[PDB]
């Protein structure tokens, strides 16, 4: 019961928005006043994972990689594969972008 999801909110989230509020959801006309009674629900519900659930209900760990480019100098580069060095022959050399 350490994993929770938000079941109710008054509006949809913006993209890449994090909502960590535990304010009591206002489903009724009367004010909730912080007490989860009639028409007032705690907005966060627990995913109760057990090792005997189907493939549609087993826990899935998700990591989402978002790649952004900014006016700053881009410093996250991929690994550059290096061919073994050959000498004493007329070859095409590419050293650190110098060709």
């Amino acid at each position: 019961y350490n994993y929770l999801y938000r079941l109710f909110r008054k509006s949809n989230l913006k993209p890449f928005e994090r909502d960590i509020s535990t304010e009591i959801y206002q489903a009724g006309n009367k004010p909730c006043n912080g007490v989860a009674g009639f028409n007032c629900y705690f907005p966060l519900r627990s995913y109760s994972f057990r090792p005997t659930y189907g493939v549609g209900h087993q826990p899935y760990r998700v990591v989402v990689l978002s790649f952004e480019l900014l006016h700053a100098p881009a410093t996250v580069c991929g690994p550059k594969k290096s061919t073994n060095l050959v000498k004493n022959k007329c070859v095409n050399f590419n050293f650190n972008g110098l060709k």
Binding site: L7, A27, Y41, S48, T52, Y53, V55
Partner: protein
């Protein structure tokens, strides 16, 4: 802001909490059923108490939303299912007395022991011994002694209990804005608010009558044939013009006639289609039986089994040290968890039962996308019907030749088709008048049409008039002879078997015309046909979200139930019974001429 959005948010929170509490309850019941130990018993009792209190408080919060301002049919259906009081509408003392009455009916039926006078040093229970002595014995007075002794003892200990039970259930139903308890049981078939597909609670009884009016000639011929064969069994006691004696029906109550296949065989010299020898010679274990059933279900186009099904189901008896319930049960634990509790023996009957329970599991699997309170059959007949159609299709000789149990050089002549169809008629057509009689008696005793001191006289007369079975001796109102059956004694609806029987052959005709079968209906196999599986899965995916009339129109095209598929199934047997009943007398008389 409106009431309907409040209902949707409340139903979402109820469904989230309900699927978890349901899983805990179902897993505790499973741990009790596969492992009968006292800590599993108290865990099941705790989980059941938590589940019942949860539905009590959620129905308390659910009855604050009126239904007349809700236009969505799914939300209205979930709130109508949720707001049902059950036994909670009464005072606490009367509700406690009703649960006490139900518990003591359960303990009287479960621990009812009836044995021989003057030999009391041990005695014999109903489920181990009385079923065997009713199905296997050929002695007239011994079956009469067991029948009369069990009905006498059980009737004298259960008659005032049923006397209070009918009054308490009538007060419960009239407090729940129903006319009677029969109307409460017919409310499962009620469809309201949908134009063209509307079905009332009151119409079902004449609908059953309308089906039974066409049931009645075929059953009469079968009854005459059974009477002729019982004339071979019993020479002088049964009359040609009269009804059957009651303790000769092969069961304790006459519900099934399938124990008379040895006595009523058309051609005893011909062998049966029992394929047990092929399983035991080739060593067909239970795991590969379920693999073959999975192969059948992917042949028809339905999705295959989950990995947790194969991991968590116990398909074999575990041993002497661990005790488990041997009753075949399909379990939908929730959260995508599906299991089968089955102590498989290497027989053809357990093979057909495994197909039946995997049909149950596939039906439970298809409506998993639905909300939790709509995760059921559209009525009580569909859930058993979709398993019984698999039991129909797996029992065909073509399917047994397909999977290697039956030899390709097997000759399928008309005689083995006649005796197979007669076995199916003794299983299927035999239970229909008993079911209709019992349900119509229960409907009139809840309605108050039957007076209190006239029960047995009316009941036996209907057994003379509907089933064509006469009592051995007259019984007065000190006895309660209906209450000896399991379903009526433990508060169970009985019309589900009638509706299941009709929907079985309706679904069978719809799939066999979907799969383009060019012969008679009893030869038909739904294997290797994707379009029939898609047509069926269109009904399996709905669950309880749609009316059962709409689901029936999705399968067979007709919203109302139909009796023509059942007589079309038994058509060559009907012609055969018309051929061989020329010397015998078709039909019965209500007089006591046999006994």
């Amino acid at each position: 802001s409106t009431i309907e959005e409040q209902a949707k948010t409340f139903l979402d929170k109820f469904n989230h909490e309900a699927e978890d509490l349901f899983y805990q309850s179902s897993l505790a019941s499973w741990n009790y059923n596969t492992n009968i130990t006292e800590e599993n018993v108290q865990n099941m009792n705790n989980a059941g108490d938590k589940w019942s209190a949860f539905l009590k408080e959620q129905s308390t919060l659910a009855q604050m939303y009126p239904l007349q301002e809700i236009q969505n049919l799914t939300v209205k259906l979930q709130l109508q299912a949720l707001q049902q009081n059950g036994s909670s509408v009464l005072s606490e003392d009367k509700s406690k007395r009703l649960n006490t009455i139900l518990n003591t009916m359960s303990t009287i039926y479960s621990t009812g022991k009836v044995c021989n006078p003057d030999n009391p040093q041990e005695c014999l229970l109903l489920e181990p011994g009385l079923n065997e002595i009713m199905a296997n014995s050929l002695d007239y007075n011994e079956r009469l002694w067991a029948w009369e002794s069990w009905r006498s003892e059980v009737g004298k200990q259960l008659r005032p209990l049923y006397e209070e039970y009918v009054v308490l259930k009538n007060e419960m139903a009239r407090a729940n804005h129903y006319e009677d308890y029969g109307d409460y049981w017919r409310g499962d078939y009620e469809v309201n608010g949908v134009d063209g597909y509307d079905y009332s609670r009151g119409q079902l009884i004449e609908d059953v009558e309308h089906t039974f009016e066409e049931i009645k000639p075929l059953y009469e011929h079968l009854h005459a044939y059974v009477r002729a064969k019982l004339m071979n069994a019993y020479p002088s006691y049964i009359s040609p013009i009269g009804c059957l004696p009651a303790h000769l029906l092969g069961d304790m109550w006459g519900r099934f006639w399938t124990n008379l296949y040895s006595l009523t065989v058309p051609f005893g010299q011909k062998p049966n289609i029992d394929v047990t020898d092929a399983m035991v010679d080739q060593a067909w274990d239970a795991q590969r039986i379920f693999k073959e059933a999975e192969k059948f279900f992917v042949s028809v186009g339905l999705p295959n089994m989950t990995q947790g099904f194969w991991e968590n189901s116990m398909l074999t008896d575990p041993g002497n040290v661990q005790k488990a319930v041997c009753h075949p049960t399909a379990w939908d634990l929730g959260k995508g968890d599906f299991r089968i509790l089955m102590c498989t023996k290497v027989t053809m009957d357990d093979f057909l039962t495994a197909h039946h329970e995997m049909g149950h599991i596939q039906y439970d699997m298809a409506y998993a996308a639905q909300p939790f309170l709509l995760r059921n059959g559209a009525n009580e007949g569909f859930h058993e019907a979709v398993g019984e159609i698999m039991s129909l299709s797996a029992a065909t000789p073509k399917h047994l030749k397909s999977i290697g149990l039956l030899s390709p050089d097997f000759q399928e002549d008309n005689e083995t088709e006649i005796n197979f169809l007669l076995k199916q008629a003794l299983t299927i057509v035999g239970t229909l008048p008993f079911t209709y009689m019992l349900e119509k008696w229960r409907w009139m005793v809840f309605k108050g049409e039957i007076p209190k001191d006239q029960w047995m006289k009316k009941w036996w007369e209907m057994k003379r008039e509907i089933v064509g079975v006469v009592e051995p001796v007259p019984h007065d109102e000190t006895y309660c002879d209906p209450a000896s059956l399991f379903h009526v004694s433990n508060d169970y609806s009985f019309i589900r078997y009638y509706t299941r029987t009709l929907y079985q052959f309706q679904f069978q005709e719809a799939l066999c015309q979907a799969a383009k079968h060019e012969g008679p209906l009893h030869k038909c196999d739904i294997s290797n046909s994707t379009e029939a599986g898609q047509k069926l899965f269109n009904m399996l995916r709905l669950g309880k979200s749609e009316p059962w009339t709409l689901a029936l129109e999705n399968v067979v095209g007709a919203k109302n139930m139909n009796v023509r598929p059942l007589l079309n199934y038994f058509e060559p047997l009907f012609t055969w019974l018309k051929d061989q009943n020329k010397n015998s007398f078709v039909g019965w008389s209500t007089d006591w001429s046999p006994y």
